[PDB]
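Box 4.2: Ligand-aware structure prediction
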Amino acid sequence: AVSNAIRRSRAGLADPNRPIGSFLFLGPTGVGKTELCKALANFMFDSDEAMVRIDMSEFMEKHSVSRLVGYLTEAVRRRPYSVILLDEVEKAHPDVFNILLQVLDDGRLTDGQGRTVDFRNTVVIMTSNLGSDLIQERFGELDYAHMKELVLGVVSHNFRPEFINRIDEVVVFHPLGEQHIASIAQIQLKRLYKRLEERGYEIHISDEALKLLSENGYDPVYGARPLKRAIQQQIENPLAQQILSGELVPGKVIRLEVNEDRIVAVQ
Amino acid sequence: LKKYTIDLTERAEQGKLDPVIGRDEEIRRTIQVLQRRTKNNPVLIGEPGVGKTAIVEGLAQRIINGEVPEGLKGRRVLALDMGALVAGAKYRGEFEERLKGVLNDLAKQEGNVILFIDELHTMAGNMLKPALARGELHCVGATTLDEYRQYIEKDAALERRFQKVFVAEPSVEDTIAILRGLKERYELHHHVQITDPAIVAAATLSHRYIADRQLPDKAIDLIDEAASSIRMQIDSKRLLRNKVTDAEIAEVLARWTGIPVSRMMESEREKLLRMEQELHHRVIGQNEAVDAVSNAIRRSRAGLADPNRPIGSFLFLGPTGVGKTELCKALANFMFDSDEAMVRIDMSEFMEKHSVSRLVGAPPGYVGYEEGGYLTEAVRRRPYSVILLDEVEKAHPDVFNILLQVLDDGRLTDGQGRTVDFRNTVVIMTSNLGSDLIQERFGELDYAHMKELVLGVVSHNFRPEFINRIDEVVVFHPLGEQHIASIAQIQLKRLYKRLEERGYEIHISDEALKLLSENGYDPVYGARPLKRAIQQQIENPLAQQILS
Amino acid sequence: LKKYTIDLTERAEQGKLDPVIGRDEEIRRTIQVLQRRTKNNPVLIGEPGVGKTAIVEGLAQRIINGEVPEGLKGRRVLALDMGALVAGAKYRGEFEERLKGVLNDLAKQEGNVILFIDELHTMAGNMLKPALARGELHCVGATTLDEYRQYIEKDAALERRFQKVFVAEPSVEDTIAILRGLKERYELHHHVQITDPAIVAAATLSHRYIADRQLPDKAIDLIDEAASSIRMQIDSKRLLRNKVTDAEIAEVLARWTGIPVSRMMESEREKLLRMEQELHHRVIGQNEAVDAVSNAIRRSRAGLADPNRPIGSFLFLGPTGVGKTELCKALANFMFDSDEAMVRIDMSEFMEKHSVSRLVGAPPGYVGYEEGGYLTEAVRRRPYSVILLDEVEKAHPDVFNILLQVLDDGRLTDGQGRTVDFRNTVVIMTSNLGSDLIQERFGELDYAHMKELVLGVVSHNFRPEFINRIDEVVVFHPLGEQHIASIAQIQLKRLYKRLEERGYEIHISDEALKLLSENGYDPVYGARPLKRAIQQQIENPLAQQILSGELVPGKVIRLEVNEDRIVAVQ
Amino acid sequence: LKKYTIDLTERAEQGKLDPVIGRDEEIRRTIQVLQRRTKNNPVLIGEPGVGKTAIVEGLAQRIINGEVPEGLKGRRVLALDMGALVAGAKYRGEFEERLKGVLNDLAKQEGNVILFIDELHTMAGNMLKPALARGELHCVGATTLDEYRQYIEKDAALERRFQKVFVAEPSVEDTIAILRGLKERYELHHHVQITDPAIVAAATLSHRYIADRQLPDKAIDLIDEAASSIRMQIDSKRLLRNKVTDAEIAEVLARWTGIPVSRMMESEREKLLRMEQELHHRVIGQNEAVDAVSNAIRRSRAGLADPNRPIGSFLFLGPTGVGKTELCKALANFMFDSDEAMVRIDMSEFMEKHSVSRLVGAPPGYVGYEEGGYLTEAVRRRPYSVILLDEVEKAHPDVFNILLQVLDDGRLTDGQGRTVDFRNTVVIMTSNLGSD
Ligand SMILES: Nc1ncnc2c1ncn2[C@@H]1O[C@H](COP(=O)(O)OP(=O)(O)OP(O)(O)=S)[C@@H](O)[C@H]1O
Ligand SMILES: Nc1ncnc2c1ncn2[C@@H]1O[C@H](COP(=O)(O)OP(=O)(O)OP(O)(O)=S)[C@@H](O)[C@H]1O
Ligand SMILES: Nc1ncnc2c1ncn2[C@@H]1O[C@H](COP(=O)(O)OP(=O)(O)OP(O)(O)=S)[C@@H](O)[C@H]1O
Ligand SMILES: Nc1ncnc2c1ncn2[C@@H]1O[C@H](COP(=O)(O)OP(=O)(O)OP(O)(O)=S)[C@@H](O)[C@H]1O
Ligand SMILES: Nc1ncnc2c1ncn2[C@@H]1O[C@H](COP(=O)(O)OP(=O)(O)O)[C@@H](O)[C@H]1O
Ligand SMILES: Nc1ncnc2c1ncn2[C@@H]1O[C@H](COP(=O)(O)OP(=O)(O)O)[C@@H](O)[C@H]1O
């Protein structure tokens, strides 16, 4: 139900005199909050130059609009048929929403563009992905009993309810938790520890860095850097206490042992 | 003139130059800066096609007919073969290669020769300022204002010789006089007959819609295109019409501007008959009452308004969801001929008294100068627009006069450098302070009784100095319940685009209009959640089986 | 023609071409445009390095081995005279006689000759314009992508006769398959055995660490240059290694880029296992952990941090005089053996409304355009550096808005318009925020008992998650008297070497080093008043006594205590 | 063609090349890039003066001496001159037949000629691009780090063919070893005795006082110029030096950057102890100011000054009319013999945030970028000066930060990017703050 409006606006079903939607999209900081436009190099035109993403959270002053309005004819006009993004458009005033009130529809941009801006064959998307406070994940494995519960509590803190009932696709994934941040970000567990896949080598990890601390140092702000701060003490040179520089002979298996949170990886 | 002897005055004595008329207000400068002692090189500056032929190229036709001043007597206007004998080699370097072979003879002519324009912004000019620095080189030039201002900066080998003849376009009436002595060259070439009301349609009707060619340029080729549509009409392989009309001109004018004959071939009084009928193609109605504000723009053609004021000065009071968006665009659809004449600005921005310079413009030096204002830069962009000032009453309780100079003296000055003119505007003000009470009855025979409680209550944020400068306080006619059923079907048009694409018939008999009668006409909240009386019970389960 | 232009199929007949493995689509596509009626001339365009000549070198082995379809079997692939058409043709019309002679010798080759005009943008041009128009010339071009757009792309009738064939660069999975086929030519030239560990690790490693060449060309010349270093091994004066390995491929990448992927032959046990022991020689204090700047260079010496963000992103917050900028000169001295071997961007003239172009470069066509930017050129030139951003809060917020891109993406595009890998650099941002919250709270302050209480720069000048994009916000504690009494000594050993370079020996009785540490200690100002009390209680009488001839060189000078003073005597 | 036998290996055979020392890991990389079958073309890249022309002259001295691998033994390093290939190539296609006539008889040796295009970025030279890729010419380029950027990096199909074998600027300890192996070329051209104190103290003194140059080009020059000064004093009219000593190096730097370490022993050291008498001849009163100024000038002349910071950085707080900018005019009259020899900057002229762009200059791409700013330019010109930041009482942190680096570590960079060292200057800041 995210490309459902493509079955409802690109064909045209679900009352097209509307914005797309800015209710809750809860997420973890870095790995599934803003990443879901980096993994969209696989859909229709292969446009990796669609980078228009805006934080629109605490903009109360009237002096933050004069940067979007010289590189407009360097990236989008050589290849017109593309994807065009916008996400996290959540809490602003009509000082900046005055441009963005006819960008909900109408396709063709007349602010300083003026021409045929063929957004009926390009895409116009708005989402609001406020998953920061008042409800969060922990690490990435829970059930689906926390889908939609806060209407005036998570996104619409001090703004009108006519900004949160004009959404077609009132959808979200889970606030999963508790076990899985080294597996949604398995890029620094799988890929980095089959790094020496040759020379007869294989890096096996202990259950201390797998199931022991898989839950402990939970902070709801940082996420990805304490993965590289609670397991920052075993990767290359604490591994190179007995592996590198003279002990490259095969016939032994790489392992970690029962110690405290910093281990010398002896073989 | 040993190599060639190309003569403009010989082309005048043989009649190869076109017969010229008018343009004697600006031959009385071209000559006055030509027969002088110094500064003897005129340059005709304007838009491309203003009449640079009409002044210079007829002067050779004026020499042999003797009405030129003395001193200019016995002067032959010459030219070069510049356009075919600037060159002579194979490769580059031919910008001014063989100029010296044909510039040395001009010194010997002893104050008789006058060399032609030859597009003197293309002569740049490696040899010209060597040739012109003595001043004996006696010439005429002509270049457009984009190719006169951008071209040179401080050349005292050029501006020492050139005089600023900023030539201008004639008016509406003047270019009609040009075509009377120009229809004698089109009676022989196209072999047609040209009449007197036929030549007025080229000038005065293209004056409002066509601007890409100046006034004695667009009125000449519009004539000669119909005269080139005659043998296209006679000899398309019974239909012999060499007498052209204004209908032949208004044909090819409709194929050129983009707009058809349907809003072109009428007087403004003749479309005024169906003005309300074109108003009420998209206006919810109440045509027994709301034709007062229809008469105000109808009062705007005679001219008994203030000439130091815009066209209109009103108040547009009523509820929301009624015509706050609908009535304002339809005033621009008729006179202002546009769907983007809209300057909707909500005046809830005046929470600070420093926000006078944001809709108008910051001073030079203060932040907010590189982008200008809001109620100025859009009017700088569109000086031919209605202006719509949403929710006036939330101006600062100490600060106003944001809208008084626009109405009293008619003009307004932003903080940029140029005064903004508001003379071709109509102000539309929606200061809803006491008319948000549509829930009362108040509307069975009269619609002003809703307004009578406002004039006792709106004036604490208003002033007596402001309500004088707006003539007719026009009340919004309400959105009745039966009146939704006329103007709600224009939202459905994308599915109307869809239903003819699939060959199916889902056309109704009283099954989809009962939810279209739940948009507007509200007691408590408004039409923003009333729009969701449609999507959650029809659009989900009925037409999700249409892409499958 | 055949006397002059290089016959590429007759080079392939002798096997004098490199075996083009892969690229099956771009040879099919360049055939599918070669057998057309109108507009039948390809141009293999793409980045320089990707195989635009190796397509047509591989088409000429697809032709003589019959793997071409019918209709192009037995077709000769010919090059063009690469500047031998424009060789000693002094006389007017000799180049037109040479080019018509090698055009009219294709019209009497019936259309059985494919011209491979390599580097098409060096072309002439009007003389090929008729023969390309009528399909008589079956040309094949190979311009680059930038050389095929900035070199006569339109020019009237010249933007249709050539049909573009885009040669995209291989992936890493393709390039390993590229290198398996070519390795029998580098084994047979260097007389080494390139190993299959070393070809998967010459395409993975040169994809990460080479930002100008993420090509198939760049995996080849790690394969080609590791094999030449084995020729350095066995031709210079089981034990004499005949194989290149992934330890020999990486030793070229530690010399090509200069990024230390090599530690299986280093004293990392000696040098990189000095946790603070090499940094405590010059940064006394800051003992929250071992050092937490010798943990990000310890996570990634060969590179085992996240390879999409820099080696270390540190905010060095603290009071004044505590060692924030000295840790960036003791780390730059530890990595590169010189204090000044970092990219020190002081935020001097960084507040302006455009100083951004100072450290990233002017836009194209402006006045300082051809000289690059300060930050960008210093990391293109050496990708493994330390980048000190001193007093980063004293910069404009527009500076951070281009400095977000180096902290998360690890890649900062510049004003010229090229992207620069900061993924191997160490980006340190010293700053002075929270300076009052550390002198007050001597243990009560955590890292987050501060980093939101000071907020008018953390919320307004800093972004909400700009402090999330930096890896470790190290907070510096103020120097107690146990510290300043011990950096009296490392500021005095700096002073003894300043005098042994003049031939004077300076001794200090411990009554006097007790006296500097009393006169140079106040916790608000850190440790600059200590070394200000060295240069006014020690070096100020010493310079007078050295100048006036009162202190002979070669004798010892004992800075002993006098009546409330430090005096120097013989 | 055969108008080109430019043999850099017979210049090394006849002993006409200078001995190169200790770049045995950039030669070993230059060798092993030159020994691979596709694009064996190294490009000794690096800053000017670093030693990258003199790596190919250490290839040529190893090929002719047999310290190379035995697949590189007996090669020929040939220095291709761009100027000699374009000279006289007036007619059309004479350069292309000249370059192809070089490429042809480079191929006749069958890869036994190592071509050396010194200043590679000068390669009119349009057509070597296919032959560079196949390994048909073994082409050691040696271009600088900024001239590769603005010619060869622009030809992105040509910088593929070249492997940058980056030549880093050596340390002081690597320059003393470079200089200990080069002094017999300068002891023999000047007929002098360059002693080892004059080599340890010429890669030390030039490595700290010189910042506009590299490292191996500064120390080597100083000794080249101290020896040509000694031979001048040997000839022109024991007590004379046959011997370049460490004091003769400092005399060559004293009149090249401002002030030496060692010229002081005669009468300047008399008038440095007489400084507070000399400064009180124009600034009476304020002994505590004249003593705090004169101690910093003595701390530098004794070599005792912190070599990273400036010589002295003072704040002159006082009332009006008490001599705060009379001391800075009597200081610059003392050490430069003119009152108007300060880099004096009235700080009251930059009361705005944009006024800090006149002390450092405009950024790249602005007006007045190419002119610098008159604090960093006037200190880059004369590095030993007095900087009077007079009336230093502004309300802008942006304009104050500039002095965060001038006073600590002693550097401040142009808008142009050129870092100007303030470690030899005396920054005085005379404000009016404790006045009442
Ligand atoms: N598909 C391939 N199979 C084998 N070798 C390849 C392939 N693609 C490229 N190469 C090799 O990559 C190296 C350089 O590629 P080139 O094709 O010579 O460069 P380029 O991309 O053609 O740009 P040019 O040559 O200036 S037109 C050569 O050794 C080629 O053989
Ligand atoms: N922890 C330390 N260990 C050794 N020397 C130190 C230490 N802290 C300060 N110093 C000395 O103090 C001088 C100035 O300190 P710096 O660290 O350079 O400045 P800073 O501490 O980074 O703070 P600032 O002024 O905000 S940039 C250095 O040159 C050192 O000599
Ligand atoms: N390793 C070295 N051994 C001996 N002499 C050296 C060494 N490195 C540099 N030199 C000397 O340093 C001086 C200048 O170095 P060069 O290499 O000639 O110039 P460069 O470094 O190539 O810079 P340029 O101007 O861009 S050619 C010469 O006198 C060289 O002999
Ligand atoms: N202590 C002094 N010894 C000698 N001349 C002095 C002294 N103080 C002031 N003068 C004279 O007074 C003038 C110097 O004034 P300045 O010293 O330049 O101003 P200032 O004392 O620095 O304070 P200001 O007004 O804040 S710049 C010159 O004419 C000096 O000759
Ligand atoms: N008063 C006039 N009398 C006769 N012909 C005119 C007159 N004004 C304009 N024209 C016609 O209009 C054209 C004007 O040419 P010109 O304005 O010189 O074009 P440009 O400015 O592009 O050189 C000519 O074809 C000329 O015959
Ligand atoms: N007369 C109308 N014709 C078409 N659509 C309308 C009309 N009035 C309201 N709407 C729809 O109702 C929605 C909300 O209207 P609203 O903003 O309350 O109108 P107003 O601004 O006049 O109060 C709009 O998105 C619009 O599509």
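In the box above, the bound molecule is adenosine-5'-diphosphate. Residues 146 and 425 of chain C are 29 Å apart (CA to CA).
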